[PDB]
Amino acid sequence: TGRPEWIWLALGTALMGLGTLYFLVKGMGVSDPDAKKFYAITTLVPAIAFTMYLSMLLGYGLTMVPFGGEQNPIYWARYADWLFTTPLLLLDLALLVDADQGTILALVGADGIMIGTGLVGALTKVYSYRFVWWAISTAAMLYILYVLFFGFTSKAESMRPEVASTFKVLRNVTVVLWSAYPVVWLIGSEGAGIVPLNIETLLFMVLDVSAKVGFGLILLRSRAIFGEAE
Numbered sequence: 001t002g003r004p005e006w007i008w009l010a011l012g013t014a015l016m017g018l019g020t021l022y023f024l025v026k027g028m029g030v031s032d033p034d035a036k037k038f039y040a041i042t043t044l045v046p047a048i049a050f051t052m053y054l055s056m057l058l059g060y061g062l063t064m065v066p067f068g069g070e071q072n073p074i075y076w077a078r079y080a081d082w083l084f085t086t087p088l089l090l091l092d093l094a095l096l097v098d099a100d101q102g103t104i105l106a107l108v109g110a111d112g113i114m115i116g117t118g119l120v121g122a123l124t125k126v127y128s129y130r131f132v133w134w135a136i137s138t139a140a141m142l143y144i145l146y147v148l149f150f151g152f153t154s155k156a157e158s159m160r161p162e163v164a165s166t167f168k169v170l171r172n173v174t175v176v177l178w179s180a181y182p183v184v185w186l187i188g189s190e191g192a193g194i195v196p197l198n199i200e201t202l203l204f205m206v207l208d209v210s211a212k213v214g215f216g217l218i219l220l221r222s223r224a225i226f227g228e229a230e
């Protein structure tokens with residue numbers, strides 16, 4: 001409670017934990033193999049986020065990085081979370097549209113580059129270089145978003161209508177929410193430092209819960225997750 005952002009870390013921990021438990025209960029008894037994949041991916045996402053939020057709350061997921069002549073508090077645990085949860089979210093989208101394996105690898109690999117370069121930027125001691133890493137990570141994000149909109153055209157003709165509808169919604173949620181992350185980083189403690197760490201933490205908490213629990217609620221309520229069966 002000594003760090004003013006503790007309240008948002010505590011709320012994030014609680015919301016990710018509750019979301020995990022809800023998805024776990026909802027997925028009980030699901031037998032359809034396709035739906036099992038979606039439940040597994042979508043429950044793992046907030047479970048991982050729960051552990052990383054808790055690590056930030058307890059202080060383990062925080063380090064001090066010297067730059068700008070100050071000791072800057074950097075929550076590195078965010079990147080450990082996103083390293084696993086962001087490819088999983090992309091996998092949900094890719095499986096919906098029956099994406100080719102090559103497209104899945106492109107997405108997951110670009111996503112790993114996005115998170116890894118974000119982490120390097122977050123830990124870099126030379127202030128100006130932090131924004132070089134931010135730019136590379138943002139380029140990887142833009143590549144991901146491009147694929148989401150322009151890499152699935154060969155699947156549109158044979159796509160079930162409910163699949164197309166649910167994918168379209170989830171893709172729009174993804175573009176809007178994922179785009180905000182580089183902005184928050186750029187203006188917050190890890191970038192220009194014009195927004196204080198406590199407000200940055202609040203912003204990431206709202207984004208994370210929306211991108212994980214909100215996204216999951218939309219997906220797991222849809223008929224698109226079930227194979228076409230009589």
Ligand SMILES: CCCCCCCC/C=C\CCCCCCCC(=O)OC[C@H](O)CO
Binds near residue numbers: 102105106113140141
């Ligand atoms: C001047 C620096 C230039 C280098 C900047 C690199 C840094 C990372 C930037 C963007 C991510 C690149 C993602 C690479 C993954 C592309 C995979 C691919 O090409 O997939 C095509 C295939 O047909 C399947 O759809």
